[PDB]
C-alpha cells in the first residue's frame, strides 16, 4: 500500500504540526490508511519541511559522482552527507546520471613486453 | 539497551567522521588473496535469479515455510506481525506473483 495521496499528505502534515514528531502512534490514529511506521517514514521522506525536493544543481551532481565510487553500496549513508536526505532522490539522480552518460605467465609476458 | 545503542551511535559517527577504515593496503592484499583462493578452487560464480527456474518455486515454498513457522507459532499477534502473516498467506495463495515481486525487488530496490 502507501499511495500517499495529497489529502492524506495534508492530514499527515497537520498531525505532525499539531501532535508532534516523536509520537508516531498518536498520528496513526487519525488517518485510517497507514500504520505508525509508514507514517513516520512518509514524514521523514516527503512530509519533512527540511527536504529539498527541487533545485538539482551541478555541485550536488559532482558531489554524488565523487561519492558513489568511494562507496558503491550504502546509499542511505550518503543521503544526509550529500544534502538530499530523501533516500530515494539520490538513487534517482544516480540513475539519471547513468542513463544520460550512456546514450605467473601473465607477469612473465609483461616482463618480456617491456624487454622486447 | 539505551546505553549500548548510544555506544553504537558514537562508534558509527566516529567511523564515518574519521574515515578510519581497515588499512587499504592490507585490504587490497586480502581481496587479492580471496581472488586467488577462489580461482584455485575454481568455483563458478553464483547466477542471479533464474526467472523460469525449476529451483525457484520450490525454494520459495521452503523459505516461506520457515518464515511462517517462526513468525507465527500459536495465538499471538501485533499489527506488524499481522501484516506479515497476511503477506505470507497471500504469497502462499499466488506464488508466481510473489516470485515476481521478489525478483523485481532484488534487482531494483537498493534501499
Amino acid at each position: 500500500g502507501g499511495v500517499w495521496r495529497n489529502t492524506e499528505d495534508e492530514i499527515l502534515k497537520a498531525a505532525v504540526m499539531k501532535y508532534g514528531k516523536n509520537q508516531w502512534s498518536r498520528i496513526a490514529s487519525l488517518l485510517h490508511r497507514k500504520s505508525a511506521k509508514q507514517c513516520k517514514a512518509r514524514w521523514y521522506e516527503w512530509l519533512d519541511p527540511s527536504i529539498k525536493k527541487t533545485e538539482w544543481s551541478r555541485e550536488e551532481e559532482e558531489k554524488l559522482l565523487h561519492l558513489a565510487k568511494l562507496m558503491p553500496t550504502q546509499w542511505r549513508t550518503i543521503a544526509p552527507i550529500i544534502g538530499r536526505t530523501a533516500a530515494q532522490c539520490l538513487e534517482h539522480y544516480e540513475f539519471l546520471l547513468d542513463k544520460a552518460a550512456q546514450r605467473d605467465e601473465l607477469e612473465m609476458l609483461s616482463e618480456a613486453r617491456a624487454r622486447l | 539497551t539505551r546505553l549500548y545503542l548510544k555506544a553504537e551511535q558514537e562508534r558509527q559517527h566516529n567511523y564515518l567522521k574519521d574515515g578510519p577504515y581497515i588499512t587499504a593496503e592490507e585490504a587490497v592484499a586480502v581481496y587479492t588473496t580471496t581472488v586467488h583462493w577462489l580461482e584455485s578452487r575454481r568455483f563458478s560464480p553464483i547466477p542471479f535469479p533464474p526467472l523460469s527456474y525449476k529451483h525457484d518455486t520450490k525454494l520459495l515454498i521452503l523459505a516461506l515455510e520457515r518464515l511462517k513457522e517462526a513468525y507465527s507459532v500459536k495465538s499471538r499477534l501485533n499489527q506488524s506481525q499481522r501484516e506479515e502473516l497476511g503477506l505470507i498467506e497471500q504469497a502462499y495463495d499466488n506464488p508466481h506473483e510473489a516470485l515476481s515481486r521478489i525478483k523485481r525487488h532484488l534487482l531494483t530496490q537498493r534501499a
Binding site: 565510487k69 | 567522521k17 585490504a27 587490497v28
Partner: peptide
Amino acid sequence: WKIPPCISNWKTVHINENFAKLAEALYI
C-alpha cells in the same frame, strides 16, 4: 534573565580521504 518556552519532548566534516583512497585502490 528570562526563562523561555520549552517544547521539545514527545508528549565534523563527515568525510575522510582515507575511505576514498581505499575505494580507488580496491577498484585498481
